[PDB]
Design a protein around this ligand. Structure first.
Ligand code: ADM
Lengths: 6, 214
């Protein structure tokens, strides 16, 4: 992923 | 930066084969007094152009730029700390800063605004300034090494996380259901743990080796 969890 | 101590701590626990016990008593290894003060609650990998942005559990935010410099914004929303590649620390504010830092400050603001409005906050239901010294990502996790010696490993597929704190010789594990538990590594060695956590700790040792080899 490119960012932490949504 | 305490990495050698952490490696020894992990080696000891892993060598004791914690998941291979007549009776695993993981709960007996918990130690509420070792709960970490800081951990990374959110992050954004924009390293293709600027760097790694992140938020700490106290709502402060920071960025480890591609040029190896760091900019941290305290949770008061104005106090700032700049750390050069050499580690030289400087202090200022969003309202009073040198023009040379305008770009990096604007970039941090963008990161802050985004993380503040998006993404879940890790460890939100837990009540606990360092900067990000080093970070890297593997195919299965992101590894974050803080200046206070802590090492955090977030696993991508199942969302589990480890927060290793060498001063306390402790490790916090956040499982899939977001249960937040802090353990003393010496007690995990004595009482054991489940196969899942044992596997994460073996992986952690390998990640620490990487931080040492870097
Ligand atoms: C990340 C790394 C692999 C696992 C998952 C999905 C894809 C491949 C991107 C996160």
């Amino acid at each position: 992923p490119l960012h932490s969890t949504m | 930066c305490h990495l050698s101590d952490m490696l020894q701590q992990l080696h000891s626990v892993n060598a004791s084969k914690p998941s291979e016990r007549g009776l695993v008593r993981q709960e007996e290894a918990e130690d509420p007094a070792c709960i970490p003060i800081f951990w990374v609650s959110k992050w954004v990998d924009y390293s293709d152009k600027y760097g790694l942005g992140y938020q700490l559990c106290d709502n402060s935010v920071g960025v480890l730029f591609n040029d190896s410099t760091r900019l941290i914004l305290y949770n008061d929303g104005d106090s700032l700390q700049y750390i050069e590649r050499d580690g030289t620390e400087s202090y200022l504010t969003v309202s009073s800063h040198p023009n040379s830092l305008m770009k990096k400050i604007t970039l941090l603001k963008y990161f802050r605004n985004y993380m503040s409005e998006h993404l879940l906050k890790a460890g939100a239901n837990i009540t606990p300034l360092p900067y990000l010294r080093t970070w890297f990502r593997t195919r299965s996790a992101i590894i974050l090494h803080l200046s206070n010696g802590s090492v955090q490993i977030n696993f991508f597929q199942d969302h589990t996380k480890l927060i290793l704190c060498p001063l306390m010789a402790a490790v916090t594990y956040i499982d899939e259901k977001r249960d937040f538990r802090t353990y003393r590594l010496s007690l995990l060695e004595e009482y054991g743990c489940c196969k899942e956590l044992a596997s994460r700790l073996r992986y952690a040792r390998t990640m620490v080796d990487k931080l040492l080899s870097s």
